[PDB]
Design an enzyme around this catalytic site. Structure first.
Site, short mmCIF file in Angstrom:
data_model
loop_
_atom_site.label_atom_id
_atom_site.label_comp_id
_atom_site.label_asym_id
_atom_site.label_seq_id
_atom_site.Cartn_x
_atom_site.Cartn_y
_atom_site.Cartn_z
N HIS A 145 46.31 19.15 30.03
CA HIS A 145 46.26 19.03 28.63
C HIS A 145 47.46 18.88 27.99
CE1 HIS A 145 45.32 20.80 24.57
NE2 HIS A 145 44.49 19.76 24.76
N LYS A 161 50.66 16.79 26.63
CA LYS A 161 51.11 15.51 26.32
C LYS A 161 52.85 15.59 26.04
CE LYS A 161 47.47 17.35 23.82
NZ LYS A 161 46.53 17.35 25.11
N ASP A 192 63.93 8.42 30.12
CA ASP A 192 65.43 8.20 30.87
C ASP A 192 65.91 9.79 31.18
OD1 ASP A 192 65.26 5.59 30.89
OD2 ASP A 192 66.67 5.10 29.33
N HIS A 240 44.43 19.76 14.55
CA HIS A 240 44.65 19.72 16.04
C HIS A 240 45.95 20.36 16.30
CE1 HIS A 240 45.01 17.95 20.10
NE2 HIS A 240 43.69 18.01 20.10
N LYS A 243 49.23 22.90 17.49
CA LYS A 243 49.39 24.05 18.34
C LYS A 243 50.78 24.71 18.04
CE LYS A 243 46.66 21.05 21.04
NZ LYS A 243 45.26 21.14 20.19
N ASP A 255 59.21 33.83 11.07
CA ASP A 255 60.31 34.43 10.00
C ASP A 255 61.43 33.27 9.67
OD1 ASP A 255 60.86 37.01 12.48
OD2 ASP A 255 59.06 36.70 10.95
C1 LIG Z 1 38.48 14.88 18.18
C2 LIG Z 1 38.63 15.46 19.67
C3 LIG Z 1 38.42 16.94 19.93
N1 LIG Z 1 38.68 17.44 21.32
C4 LIG Z 1 38.45 18.81 21.18
C5 LIG Z 1 38.48 19.65 22.55
C6 LIG Z 1 40.08 19.23 22.99
N2 LIG Z 1 40.14 20.10 24.16
C7 LIG Z 1 40.97 20.88 24.39
O1 LIG Z 1 41.75 21.19 23.29
N3 LIG Z 1 41.10 20.93 25.86
C8 LIG Z 1 40.20 20.46 26.32
C9 LIG Z 1 39.97 20.63 27.57
C10 LIG Z 1 38.90 19.70 28.10
C11 LIG Z 1 38.25 18.79 27.27
C12 LIG Z 1 38.50 19.00 25.89
C13 LIG Z 1 39.47 19.62 25.68
C14 LIG Z 1 40.28 17.80 22.99
C15 LIG Z 1 39.96 17.13 21.58
N4 LIG Z 1 37.88 14.78 20.46
C16 LIG Z 1 38.35 13.62 21.38
O2 LIG Z 1 39.59 13.79 21.76
C17 LIG Z 1 37.24 13.09 22.24
C18 LIG Z 1 37.79 12.09 23.10
C19 LIG Z 1 36.90 11.31 23.60
C20 LIG Z 1 35.66 11.61 23.69
F1 LIG Z 1 34.74 11.10 24.42
C21 LIG Z 1 35.07 12.76 22.86
C22 LIG Z 1 35.89 13.45 22.15
#
Ligand SMILES: C[C@@H](CN1CCC(n2c(=O)[nH]c3ccccc32)CC1)NC(=O)c1ccc(F)cc1
Length: 580
Positions: A126, A128, A133, A412, A414, A419
């Site tokens: 998960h 990103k 470099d 979305h 995190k 404080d």
């Molecule tokens: C909007 C977004 C939401 N989505 C929520 C769950 C999230 N999520 C986590 O946080 N941990 C996860 C672990 C496994 C799988 C999903 C996880 C990802 C974002 N949907 C997509 O990005 C998407 C892309 C391609 C599609 F075909 C459908 C939807």
């Protein structure tokens, strides 16, 4: 510092003082800064992505092939830059990592992509991260994928040969993930919803860039995951995928002077070691918090019971609030979540299996059950929990088809702020999946301030952290809408002003749009009738626009009683560990 010993919060990386770090709200500035870092790469680019859409543009609007991700990476790769990419291998979900991988490796032989995992598992990669470099590193909740790019405007519409186009979101980038998720990702520049009919779902996220020592720490996490992934299949063990190696560490000679510690979640399946250092830093930062907590997370699934849900982040917030209530401190907790979980589903008919499953564990953490936060606070302070905690969502409105439209701002992020001094930006949601370490692989950074600014804390003098104070004032000023005083974040004057706007904005959106979720639908039989009524936004648009002038900001209260008469659990085959 070295990597033979575990460090603070049981992290593989030690705190790096004197780190120059900068935060990013929304994907606009983040993707733009990433493009600038990619452009100045001289040796290596490390990329990890749960979802990478190659045709995404890092700068908008798209007039040419410049600023397109796969084009930019192709332009650096053949100047000699080695681009190493790790992409999460789905279970065909619909992210289609096969098209992303084959397209990325088709660009240049200097671009190598490995997909993981290959075996059947419920967990995912998960984190990103993009490192240039081993000196500049980007991380947070933003994937280089469709639907992530957004700015303060949170545009609901995109109406106006790339020479003369003026669309901000092209083709698959114009999305509303609740309405319908992505399909046909091999056709990037085609629409899969109706821009004239269906509005956009705005995307709120928080990113961060670090310079110097934490970036090499983050590059070492990539190098460990890379060479470990080299061991996972016979195709990867070939010299085609080169071993990546760290750049030794004191070759380390607009963002602020900080102290940054890199934290992560890894396990035997994701890497070669175990770590739940994000979880540790989350529990400790809550425990040592003296004044307030600002939480802005996509999910909020916590409160341990030993069997279903195990992480104790929510249990740390109840203990911290229960102590401030006994000492008599002034202590606030702001929790901002997306109004709906991020999955395709018809909320007019109840939401669906996946959304209700997340809602079950969301409300179980918040208000429903013995383990919930509010029920345990009311057990010790009664209705005075409204003074210590405030859980809200976001929603904006625009115009489409000649009448006002509305949509939630999908949070979305995190991020956690404590404080006006300490910040945590990463990919880890507040759930067992991201926090336990044994499941999803995650990344996060702990940014503690060293240089301080004059500020206010409950009407008292307070030297607040320069990096953290500026991030909260950016979050507050945007969700609250020029005459506002945002210095004091815990006083009664602001906290009352905060809750008044969250409830008033929630009211107006309910009168005009009859939006979901809402406190007005506590059952499915009631929900069936609530949706059979046409809202005022389309009945009399002039009247609707009249009442919308009273909305200030995007802050709306989170509906706690929404469908509170329902099971919300599915009858089903899927292990409940999937949503926890
Ligand atoms: C909007 C977004 C939401 N989505 C929520 C769950 C999230 N999520 C986590 O946080 N941990 C996860 C672990 C496994 C799988 C999903 C996880 C990802 C974002 N949907 C997509 O990005 C998407 C892309 C391609 C599609 F075909 C459908 C939807």
């Amino acid at each position: 510092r070295d990597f033979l010993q575990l460090h603070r919060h049981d992290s593989y990386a030690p705190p790096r003082p004197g780190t120059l770090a900068r935060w990013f709200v929304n994907g606009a500035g983040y993707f733009a800064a990433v493009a600038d870092a990619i452009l100045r790469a001289q040796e290596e680019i490390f990329i990890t992505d749960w979802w990478l859409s190659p045709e995404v543009y890092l700068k908008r609007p798209a007039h040419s092939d410049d600023w397109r991700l796969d084009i930019m990476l192709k332009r650096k790769a053949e100047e000699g830059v080695r681009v190493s990419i790790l992409l999460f291998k789905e279970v065909e979900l619909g992210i289609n990592s096969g098209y992303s991988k084959r397209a990325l490796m088709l660009l240049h032989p200097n671009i190598k992509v490995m997909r993981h995992p290959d075996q059947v598992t419920l967990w995912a990669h998960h984190e990103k991260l993009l490192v240039v470099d081993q000196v500049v590193a980007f991380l947070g909740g933003l994937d280089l994928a469709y639907g992530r790019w957004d700015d303060l405007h949170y545009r609901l519409t995109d109406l106006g040969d790339l020479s003369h186009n003026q669309f901000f979101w092209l083709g698959k980038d114009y999305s509303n993930l609740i309405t319908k998720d992505w399909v046909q990702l091999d056709r990037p520049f085609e629409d899969f919803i109706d821009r004239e009919t269906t509005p956009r779902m705005p995307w709120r996220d928080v990113g961060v860039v670090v310079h110097g020592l934490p970036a090499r720490d983050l590059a070492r996490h990539f190098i460990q995951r890379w060479n470990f992934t080299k061991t996972t299949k016979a195709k990867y063990k070939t010299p085609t995928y080169p071993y990546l190696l760290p750049k030794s560490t004191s070759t380390a000679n607009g963002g602020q002077c900080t102290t940054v510690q890199v934290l992560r979640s890894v396990d035997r399946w994701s890497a070669g070691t175990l770590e739940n250092s994000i979880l540790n830093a989350y529990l400790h930062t809550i425990r040592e918090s003296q004044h307030f907590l600002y939480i802005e997370n996509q999910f909020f699934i916590s409160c341990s019971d030993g069997r279903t849900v195990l992480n104790k982040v929510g249990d740390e917030i109840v203990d911290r609030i229960l102590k401030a209530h006994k000492q008599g401190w002034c202590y606030r907790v702001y929790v901002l979540l997306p109004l709906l979980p991020g999955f395709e589903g018809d909320i007019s008919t109840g939401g669906g299996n996946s959304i209700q499953a997340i809602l079950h564990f969301t409300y179980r953490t918040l208000c429903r059950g013995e383990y919930s936060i509010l029920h345990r606070l009311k057990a010790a302070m009664g209705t005075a929990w409204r003074d210590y905690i405030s859980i809200c969502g976001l929603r904006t409105h625009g115009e489409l088809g000649g009448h006002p439209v509305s949509e939630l701002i999908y949070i979305h992020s995190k991020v956690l702020i404590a404080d006006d001094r300490t910040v945590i930006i990463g990919s880890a949601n507040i759930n067992d999946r991201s926090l336990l370490g044994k499941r999803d692989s995650e990344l996060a950074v702990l940014i503690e301030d060293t240089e301080t600014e004059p500020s206010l804390m409950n009407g008292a003098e307070y030297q607040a952290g320069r990096f953290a104070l500026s991030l909260r004032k950016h979050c507050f000023g945007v969700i609250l809408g020029p005459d506002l005083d945002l210095r004091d974040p815990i006083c009664d004057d602001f906290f009352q002003l905060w809750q008044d706007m969250a409830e008033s904005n929630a009211n107006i959106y309910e009168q005009i749009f009859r939006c979901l979720p809402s406190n007005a639908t506590r059952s499915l039989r009631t929900l069936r009738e609530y949706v059979a009524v046409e809202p005022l936004a389309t009945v009399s648009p002039p009247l609707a626009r009249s009442e919308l002038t009273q909305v200030q900001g995007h802050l709306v209260h989170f509906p706690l009683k929404f469908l509170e008469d329902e099971s919300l659990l599915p009858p089903g085959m899927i292990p409940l560990e999937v949503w926890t």
